[PDB]
Design a protein around this ligand. Structure first.
Ligand code: PC1
Lengths: 55, 206, 48
């Protein structure tokens, strides 16, 4: 009985860490893409400037 | 919770392992110890707190930070139901386990009957002191059964002292300095005669 | 006297083979209880 109670107890925390870790990774991972979209948008502006020089 | 909750669980497994002598039993102890360590493994990783307001402010996709929060919180509410498990394990479990539950219970009853025998003997022995101060027929009453055996030796005419005793210690004490030191042979009756005789080509059976 | 394979009623315990074997066959059976619970809790909804 004490081994089952300690198993579900520690296992409950492991699941809690799994969720919060997932919710944090998905957020940080999304932020990574968001920064990439911003850099791609500004990169086009620089690309437009370079093309204007060539013209 | 974390500290001191497994101390007792280590003493039990240790003794169970010490009693194991055959390699087969030692193997089962390893399997048993693994499951205990597996179930009793402690988990401490400092579950981090999420501040959705911080992420919501710095940068996030519209509706994403809120959708993650509401969905995240929903699962945090769910938790294990320790009550249901607590009952089933205590009501009945492993009908195969009942095999040794009833084996060790009868095994213990065997050695509890012996423990009571030696205990009750030492209890009755308290009133018996100085055998040399009791009369003959009173001592035989303390050791009820000797008179019955004594009648068996008499009615069968086994009146050679110590014939039916495997170790006739009384026979050795009387022969400590006897000529031709010998004790009566086991179960020797004063009437049996296994003597033989033969006639050969020579005289005197030689 | 019916459901124990022994050549005598004078039971003498000199090893814990029969004891530990029945414990691993019992405590192990209750494995997957927490993982099974995680299935229900996690299959409830998708975080995304
Ligand atoms: C008091 C009133 C009533 C009295 C009633 C009579 C009571 C008699 C008490 C018992 C006497 C027993 C004598 C046995 C002697 C055996 C000694 C021995 O073992 O020898 C060892 C001896 C000595 O070995 P030992 O190791 O035993 O002793 C060594 C002795 N020292 C220490 C000195 C070295 O070796 C032998 O084997 C020789 C055997 C010779 C036997 C000769 C004796 C024969 C007589 C017995 C037959 C009589 C039958 C009568 C039947 C009549 C029927 C009508």
């Amino acid at each position: 009985a004490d081994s089952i109670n300690n198993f579900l107890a520690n296992e409950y925390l492991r699941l809690q860490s799994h969720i919060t870790s997932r919710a944090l990774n998905i957020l940080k991972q999304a932020q990574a893409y968001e920064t990439m979209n911003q850099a791609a948008l500004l990169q086009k502006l620089i690309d437009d400037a370079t093309s204007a020089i060539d013209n | 919770q974390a500290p001191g909750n497994q101390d007792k669980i280590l003493k039990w497994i240790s003794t169970l392992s010490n009693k194991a002598t055959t390699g087969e039993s030692r193997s089962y102890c390893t399997q048993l110890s693994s499951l205990v360590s597996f179930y009793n493994k402690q988990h401490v990783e400092q579950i981090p707190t999420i501040d959705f307001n911080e992420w919501k402010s710095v940068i996030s996709t519209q509706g994403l930070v809120d959708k993650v929060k509401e969905n995240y919180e929903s699962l945090i509410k769910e938790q294990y139901n320790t009550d249901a498990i607590s009952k089933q394990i205590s009501s009945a479990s492993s009908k195969a386990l009942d095999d040794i539950e009833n084996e060790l219970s009868f095994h213990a009853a065997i050695w509890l009957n012996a423990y009571a025998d030696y205990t009750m003997f030492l209890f009755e022995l308290e009133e018996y002191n100085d055998p040399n101060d009791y009369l003959m027929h009173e001592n035989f009453d303390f050791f009820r059964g000797l008179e019955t055996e004594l009648e068996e030796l008499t009615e069968t005419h086994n009146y050679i002292p110590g014939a039916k005793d495997d170790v006739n210690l009384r026979g050795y004490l009387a022969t400590q300095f006897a000529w031709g030191k010998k004790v009566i042979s086991f179960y020797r009756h004063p009437a049996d005669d296994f003597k033989c005789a033969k006639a050969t080509k020579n005289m005197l059976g030689r | 006297e019916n459901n124990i394979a022994s050549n005598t009623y004078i039971l003498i315990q000199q090893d814990v083979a029969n004891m530990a074997k029945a414990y691993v066959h019992d405590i192990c059976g209750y494995i997957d209880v927490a993982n099974k619970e995680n299935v229900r809790i996690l299959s409830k909804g998708d975080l995304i």
